Design an enzyme around this catalytic site. Structure first.
Site, mmCIF file in Angstrom:
data_model
loop_
_atom_site.group_PDB
_atom_site.id
_atom_site.type_symbol
_atom_site.label_atom_id
_atom_site.label_comp_id
_atom_site.label_asym_id
_atom_site.label_seq_id
_atom_site.Cartn_x
_atom_site.Cartn_y
_atom_site.Cartn_z
ATOM 1 N N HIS B 351 0.780 -1.236 0.000
ATOM 2 C CA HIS B 351 0.000 0.000 0.000
ATOM 3 C C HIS B 351 0.815 1.291 0.000
ATOM 4 O O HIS B 351 0.261 2.352 0.280
ATOM 5 C CB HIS B 351 -0.921 0.041 1.226
ATOM 6 N N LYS B 542 -8.687 14.184 4.416
ATOM 7 C CA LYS B 542 -7.840 13.001 4.428
ATOM 8 C C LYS B 542 -6.812 13.266 5.532
ATOM 9 O O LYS B 542 -6.714 14.388 6.025
ATOM 10 C CB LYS B 542 -7.137 12.862 3.079
ATOM 11 N N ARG B 543 -6.040 12.255 5.918
ATOM 12 C CA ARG B 543 -5.032 12.459 6.959
ATOM 13 C C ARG B 543 -4.049 13.566 6.561
ATOM 14 O O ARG B 543 -3.738 13.741 5.381
ATOM 15 C CB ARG B 543 -4.278 11.150 7.219
ATOM 16 N N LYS B 548 0.490 14.634 0.799
ATOM 17 C CA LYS B 548 -0.871 14.928 0.348
ATOM 18 C C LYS B 548 -1.008 16.413 -0.006
ATOM 19 O O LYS B 548 -2.009 16.843 -0.586
ATOM 20 C CB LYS B 548 -1.882 14.526 1.428
ATOM 21 N N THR B 650 -8.687 6.617 -1.944
ATOM 22 C CA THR B 650 -10.032 6.050 -2.047
ATOM 23 C C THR B 650 -11.055 7.157 -1.827
ATOM 24 O O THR B 650 -12.192 7.071 -2.305
ATOM 25 C CB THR B 650 -10.283 4.898 -1.036
ATOM 26 N N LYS B 654 -14.926 8.216 -3.575
ATOM 27 C CA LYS B 654 -16.142 8.576 -2.849
ATOM 28 C C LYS B 654 -16.735 9.879 -3.391
ATOM 29 O O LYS B 654 -17.954 9.997 -3.560
ATOM 30 C CB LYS B 654 -15.837 8.727 -1.357
HETATM 31 N N1 LIG Z 1 1.176 0.628 6.549
HETATM 32 N N2 LIG Z 1 0.926 1.627 5.986
HETATM 33 N N3 LIG Z 1 0.675 2.624 5.418
HETATM 34 C C1 LIG Z 1 0.406 2.595 4.011
HETATM 35 C C2 LIG Z 1 -0.981 3.139 3.639
HETATM 36 O O1 LIG Z 1 -1.695 3.529 4.513
HETATM 37 N N4 LIG Z 1 -1.334 3.162 2.364
HETATM 38 C C3 LIG Z 1 -2.645 3.674 1.895
HETATM 39 O O2 LIG Z 1 -3.470 2.551 1.496
HETATM 40 C C4 LIG Z 1 -4.756 2.957 0.914
HETATM 41 C C5 LIG Z 1 -5.573 1.688 0.530
HETATM 42 O O3 LIG Z 1 -4.776 0.903 -0.390
HETATM 43 C C6 LIG Z 1 -4.407 3.818 -0.417
HETATM 44 O O4 LIG Z 1 -5.576 4.254 -1.105
HETATM 45 C C7 LIG Z 1 -3.563 5.080 -0.013
HETATM 46 O O5 LIG Z 1 -3.215 5.870 -1.178
HETATM 47 C C8 LIG Z 1 -2.303 4.562 0.676
HETATM 48 O O6 LIG Z 1 -1.515 5.703 1.106
HETATM 49 C C1 LIG Z 2 -12.077 7.262 2.578
HETATM 50 C C2 LIG Z 2 -11.406 7.742 3.903
HETATM 51 C C3 LIG Z 2 -10.021 7.964 3.979
HETATM 52 C C4 LIG Z 2 -9.067 7.811 2.752
HETATM 53 O O1 LIG Z 2 -9.022 9.075 2.060
HETATM 54 P P1 LIG Z 2 -7.868 9.400 0.979
HETATM 55 O O2 LIG Z 2 -8.123 10.760 0.531
HETATM 56 O O3 LIG Z 2 -7.762 8.304 -0.011
HETATM 57 O O4 LIG Z 2 -6.561 9.404 1.845
HETATM 58 C C5 LIG Z 2 -9.475 8.421 5.125
HETATM 59 N N1 LIG Z 2 -10.244 8.649 6.211
HETATM 60 C C6 LIG Z 2 -11.595 8.436 6.176
HETATM 61 C C7 LIG Z 2 -12.410 8.694 7.459
HETATM 62 C C8 LIG Z 2 -12.192 7.981 5.019
HETATM 63 O O5 LIG Z 2 -13.570 7.712 4.990
#
Ligand SMILES: [N-]=[N+]=NCC(=O)N[C@@H]1O[C@H](CO)[C@@H](O)[C@H](O)[C@H]1O
Ligand SMILES: *Cc1c(COP(=O)(O)O)cnc(C)c1O
Ligand SMILES: [N-]=[N+]=NCC(=O)N[C@@H]1O[C@H](CO)[C@@H](O)[C@H](O)[C@H]1O
Ligand SMILES: *Cc1c(COP(=O)(O)O)cnc(C)c1O
Lengths: 810, 810
Positions: B351, B542-543, B548, B650, B654
């Site tokens: 990931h 997002k985090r 990012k 992801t 959404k």
């Molecule tokens: N262990 N660890 N950390 C790696 C991690 O969170 N990867 C995240 O996976 C999610 C689910 O595969 C991806 O959509 C994000 O882009 C990716 O940053």
């Molecule tokens: C979908 C989701 C994420 C992942 O968001 P990205 O923009 O792909 O990092 C993180 N936190 C929550 C609460 C989410 O629902």
């Protein structure tokens, strides 16, 4: 099956079965193909619990509407033991559930053995609180039990190599179906901090906060549809607690450790900070709940008319200064008015005279943990001593003797003195104990305020200690006098007119024999140990302590063994001597006594010459559920504490109600028991309190007895030479040393009288008919020892409320 | 109310109401007079839960009878969020419960807001596991989710003085009605100890034991009556643990701390012992459960035919050596056979490519904690490198590059190398990411075993992310193409024929407006902050992480503000810029970025000249439940990570499914999204991966951009001089320093392109009709991003099982 167990109606049995299947499916999420006995136990527990809920809700609604005076019983121990059968008994559901489970192809007795004991107590003091809750509900009092929900109760005892091993009592492992968490009523409790004197009043600031989460358990009265509440507090950190990140979250355990484990001491004071925290934790959370409920029923003048707080010993003694703190610092009442309210609200029950058991907290501890409370205590002491000085002018020693503050190495606070000063009533737990309190330890206080001192002889609940554990006996009794005695034990006195009834005599003896056979079987089932059901069951079960003198019992056992070995082909009444009880983890002498017992058994039980004439068994992990099994099977009850040391005793009452004769000293409640049944129907022996005092004034010299009693000398020499410990010849050197040089309990002084009276016991057992007739005279006069009588006296003479036997709509 | 929410039949509504009252009474022990909204929430939760139980039991019975190949998804994170509405949606009970509660005088939406989020995850990785469980159940796979039941999940974020404050997420406070404790299936896990080589095999001895207690939670498939299981392990000490007495009992927390809290890092590796313990704890308990179930269905040759183990990243990588340990040490299989079984059973999903996120455990840690596993790992490495040496003779650097053991300061074990060697399949989570894996970080491995490398583009479940959070949109879609798309999202492509439909265009735009009004209201309700519902909702949630680039977003915001201040009376499309996300507690730069955002808002939101033309809000405590509210209300989705850093993303999916247009870089899944919808319907900008590489080869010099872009220079000077921090002029010195001298993510390099493309976004928003038509083209082509498609690919290409849309008898 049997009468006293209620009706097994067609509609109810059908209803129980369907609700049983409903819970097994929806609640446990199982099917009859993968369900285990434990799953079945829970399905039944939830089914029975359902029947409580309607009554529980309307009982509490009732109290809200009528708003009677409420009774708050504060205790850091509630030794409840199993709850399933007790609930069925009080709801008259036993036969219906028995039938319903039978039809489902299950043995209810087997399922009952699966429930874990709620062991939130050490012994007598904790069990007393449990019996009291049962009686208060049965007498229709608006009573609440308040305590701590320990994650770990009294430890489970394992015997390894003859030694006691302790293992954590993880009683909540599989969940507790009887409790209801009430997170919505969580309250904050304060610790540490500092006192800040402002313009108007003092303020306790910069404190650390711990949350108290309550868990409610229903307490059903005997078939009166009354269901009271026992609320136990659990410690929870605040979410902003300690808020690296990970460590701050992990350190939450520090705060939550408050409700983690019960201190395992019986009649022994351990001044540890964690224990002080538990004591304040229960008191602080409980008082806020009390005041909250009170306000939701402004002028605390009526507070004593709507509230009664009973302190079970001094453990919750901080309620006195905490109540003052709240009324003075928070409600803003003047000291004098606050004190008047406090005294009229609080009452204190003393449970011991042993110096090592009294709570004396180091001032430096209170100073750091509860700074505001120590200031309040000093103020209370100041005003109290001013009263003493005015009543006994110039008597400076009395002043130092009565002070709540004890000087010396480290200054300490005598919590018992605090309780007497701040309570309108102080009681002992047996006539002789209450008299000793007025004549000795609290003499100065009695002279100052004689009206405060009372007696409330202990008792036990006839529901758990007769109907529940001995249905066979309850049945033959009901057959001849009805069922009314179950909630009016004084009626057993009608049995006296059956003492010459040949049928009754035969039934009484038959029930006992059946109980002994059942217990003899149980011993081989769960513990694998053969015993002779025809022998006299001689049992002593209670916590291991030097004052209870299990050692005197050991001396008799060894005497019997030496006599047999001396004249092998002489006839002697066969005996199975059973001794059980836990020793506090840090009580060395008590652990050595246990080793001695097993060591004796190792020699006696394997001596070919003895045969099945004498057996010595140590009952492992004695607890409430085990008591319910062995007491009904006993023939002789051993209550042999040194006169003046056992405040009351309650195990003695359980044995009397279940058909065992008693051999004991004139100590605690034994005195009133013999008085009720007649001394000719009791096996009394040994020094009386006055004899012990005479000996102390003169000086106790164990050597004298050793020199004049050949049989005693032989025993001591056997112990000393390694007769009972071949591989470790000096294993019992500490025991012999204590017995010979510093025995505070004069074991040797009562040896001769004890052995002699044990001979009279054996003589009577040889005459079955006369033994049983004496038994009948004991059971018939055991009515006074019902906790219903005890509670009615507390209600009328201390709390100012009238008990009621009126049924509530179901 | 609305179609997609099911039928509100007469019989069912009546049945729901009575069961609701039953639970309120018997389960919660309350009455309508003292019940609070929380009590009502629980009564409803238990009522809905009941409907799951029958299906849950027969689903598991079904798998036992047919014995299909079972899928085990191991993850140390399951970001589930609320469960009530999701359960109703999948059981078609939403309208019935809505009606039933309505008739009881309750607002179901109000009650739903009471449930606590199950926040056992950090972000994308944890949410992915949650969506996957939903899809596996919907596709009828015999799948089990295995993880840890953390007592405390991701921390709750509080914003104080513009700074992030963390507080414990005590999500179990009020109890969890969805889980079922299964203490009967508790298993032992070993730690520490030593290895002892005997005659036949090695033995791991003198270990410390920790018990693993499982808790099962039902996972319902979408209206197919399938209910799978998510089993989470909880750490419990053994009762003989550490067995002064009191301290031994208190030290049990040491062992139970294993399942206490979730490590709050997103894409960052922290080599702490406690974390290693959590990883082995899940792996050890899970594998025993797997083998147990397998044996109850001797010859492990068929093990790979009945078992598939999917490793969610390397967190559960110890499953490889643990499986070998069990097969070799316990089952006694020869190494080669054991290895064959292991490889065919395990599959690994990567990931990330960020070096700081890869797990490299110090050998000294494994050596002390898992001595036997380190020996097995060395053996695996030895055999693997022998294979490499034979395929690439003489290539000594390749040998050191591919070794599982990394030399250096401290020797470490590269867990990613371990996973590739011991798995038959390795996949990336987006086409571009999977290609990067083969071209860069895992190039050597791809050359050795090309057949192992695959791609499985991520997806999201249309149940929670469309029907549940955006019923209005799901309804207008269903009105025109039916409901079949909910479990076959590719059908949304039929919406393309409505792109010119005036009615549809109007409905789509109406739903969005309603969502924005609802969210705009929510912001004032729970957070008290006024916003203009007519403005463009520009959101980035997002985090918080440097890759990012929330900082690039900040630069644009400040640019917009400076332009307004420059020409106040010029028209600009109104915007509400929303940024939300949590920062790892120890990630300093991330916490400074949050402060910067609030600081910007403090200036912008209170500037009279700006008016309601620009607002900057920081969304506090972003979590799953908040995502369900803000995503449906968004107009612009910000997905601006530096090309090559976001493995997939992801949140981007959404937003696309809910009617927002996307502005982003050609990174992660953004590439496939633009490909599906057409680049003309996406706002793509910035460097592509190849451009970033060119820049790195040349050397990134931020100063160059600062010198050539006046607007950028002005911003940096404002930050540096204290324009956004009057009282603390150098507050943002670290941010400026990083941006100017060591920005690993080239924020400045994409600034110009970003601002320019943001202008094109504003231009399109000015034409409502054309903006909506582009939105329709996005929603219509979002079908590929359903996790059902993702799971079907995993099933067919990795696990070797066929998905099924067949309903099970209910
Ligand atoms: N262990 N660890 N950390 C790696 C991690 O969170 N990867 C995240 O996976 C999610 C689910 O595969 C991806 O959509 C994000 O882009 C990716 O940053
Ligand atoms: C979908 C989701 C994420 C992942 O968001 P990205 O923009 O792909 O990092 C993180 N936190 C929550 C609460 C989410 O629902
Ligand atoms: N605290 N403390 N310990 C005191 C204590 O347990 N007292 C016991 O009370 C019970 C109940 O009053 C008595 O029957 C026992 O005789 C007495 O020893
Ligand atoms: C009744 C009881 C006691 C008290 O027994 P005494 O002999 O009065 O000390 C102690 N433990 C248990 C389990 C009891 O049931």
């Amino acid at each position: 099956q049997i009468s006293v167990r209620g009706l097994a109606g067609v509609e109810n049995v059908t209803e129980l079965k369907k609700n049983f299947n409903r819970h097994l499916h929806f609640t446990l999420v199982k099917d009859r193909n993968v369900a285990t006995p434990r799953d079945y136990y829970f399905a039944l527990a939830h089914t029975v619990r359902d029947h409580l809920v309607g009554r529980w809700i309307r009982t509490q609604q009732h109290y809200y509407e009528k708003d009677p005076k409420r009774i708050y019983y504060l205790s850091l121990e509630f030794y409840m033991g199993r709850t399933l059968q007790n609930t069925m008994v009080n709801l008259a559901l036993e036969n219906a559930c028995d039938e319903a489970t039978y039809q489902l192809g299950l043995d209810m007795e087997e399922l009952e053995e699966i429930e874990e004991d709620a062991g939130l107590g050490n012994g007598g003091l904790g069990r007393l609180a449990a019996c009291f809750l049962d009686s208060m509900a049965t007498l229709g009092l608006a009573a609440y039990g308040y305590g701590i929900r320990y994650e770990f109760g009294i430890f489970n005892q394992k015997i390894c190599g003859g030694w006691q091993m302790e293992e954590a009592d993880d009683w909540l492992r599989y969940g507790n179906p009887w409790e209801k968490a009430r997170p919505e009523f969580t309250l904050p409790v304060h610790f540490y901090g500092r006192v800040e004197h402002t313009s108007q009043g003092a303020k306790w600031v910069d404190t650390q906060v711990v949350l108290a989460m309550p868990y409610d358990t229903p307490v059903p009265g005997y078939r009166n549809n009354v269901v009271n509440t026992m609320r136990l507090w659990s410690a929870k950190a605040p979410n902003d607690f300690n808020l690296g990140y990970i460590q701050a979250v992990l350190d939450r355990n520090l705060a939550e450790n408050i409700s983690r484990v019960l201190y395992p001491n019986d009649n022994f004071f351990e001044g540890k900070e964690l224990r002080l925290k538990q004591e304040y934790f229960v008191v602080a959370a409980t008082l806020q709940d009390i005041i909250r409920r009170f306000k939701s029923s402004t002028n605390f003048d009526a507070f004593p008319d709507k509230v009664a707080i009973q302190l079970n010993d001094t453990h919750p003694s901080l309620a006195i200064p905490e109540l003052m703190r709240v009324l003075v610092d928070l409600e803003r009442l003047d000291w004098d008015k606050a004190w008047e309210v406090t005294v009229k609200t609080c009452a204190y029950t003393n449970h011991t005279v042993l110096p090592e058991a009294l709570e004396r907290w180091p001032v430096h501890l209170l100073e750091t943990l509860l700074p505001r409370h120590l200031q309040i205590i000093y103020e209370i002491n100041q005003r109290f001593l001013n009263r003493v000085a005015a009543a006994f002018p110039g008597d400076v020693d009395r002043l130092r003797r009565m002070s709540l503050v004890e000087e010396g190495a480290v200054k300490r606070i005598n919590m018992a003195h605090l309780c007497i000063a701040g309570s309108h009533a102080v009681n002992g737990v047996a006539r002789i104990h209450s008299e000793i309190l007025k004549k000795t330890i609290f003499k100065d206080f009695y002279e100052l305020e004689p009206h405060k001192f009372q007696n409330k002889t202990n008792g036990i609940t006839p529901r758990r200690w007769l109907v529940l554990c001995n249905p066979g006996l309850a049945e033959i009794i009901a057959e001849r006098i009805g069922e009314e005695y179950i909630s009016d034990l004084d009626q057993l006195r009608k049995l006296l007119s059956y003492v010459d009834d040949e049928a009754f005599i035969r039934d009484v003896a038959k029930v006992k024999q059946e109980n002994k056979l059942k217990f003899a079987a149980y011993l081989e089932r769960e513990y694998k140990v053969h015993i002779n059901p025809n022998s006299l069951f001689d049992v002593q079960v209670k916590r291991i302590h030097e004052y209870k003198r299990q050692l005197l019992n050991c001396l008799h056992v060894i005497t019997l063994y030496n006599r047999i070995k001396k004249e092998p082909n002489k006839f002697v009444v066969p005996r199975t001597v059973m001794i059980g009880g836990k020793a506090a983890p840090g009580y060395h002498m008590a652990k050595m006594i246990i080793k001695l017992i097993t060591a004796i058994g190792d020699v006696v039980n394997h001596d070919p010459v003895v045969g099945d004439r004498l057996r010595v068994i140590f009952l492992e992990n004695y607890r409430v559920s085990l008591a319910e099994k062995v007491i009904p099977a006993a023939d002789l009850s051993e209550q042999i504490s040194t006169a003046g040391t056992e405040a009351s005793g309650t195990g003695n009452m359980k044995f009397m109600l279940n058909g065992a004769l008693t051999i004991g000293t004139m100590d605690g409640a034994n005195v009133e028991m013999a008085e009720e049944a007649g001394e000719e129907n009791f096996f009394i022996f040994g020094m009386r309190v006055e004899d012990v005092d005479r000996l102390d004034q003169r000086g106790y010299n164990a050597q004298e007895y050793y020199d004049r009693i050949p049989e005693l000398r032989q025993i001591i020499e056997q112990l000393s030479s390694g007769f009972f410990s071949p591989k470790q010849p000096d294993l019992f050197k500490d025991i012999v040393n204590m017995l010979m040089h510093h025995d505070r309990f004069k074991v040797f002084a009562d040896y001769e009288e004890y052995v002699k009276c044990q001979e009279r016991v054996s003589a009577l057992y040889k005459n079955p008919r006369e033994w049983t007739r004496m038994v009948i005279r004991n059971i018939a006069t055991s009515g006074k020892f019902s906790s219903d009588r005890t509670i009615a006296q507390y209600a009328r003479e201390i709390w100012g409320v009238e008990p009621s036997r009126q049924r509530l709509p179901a």
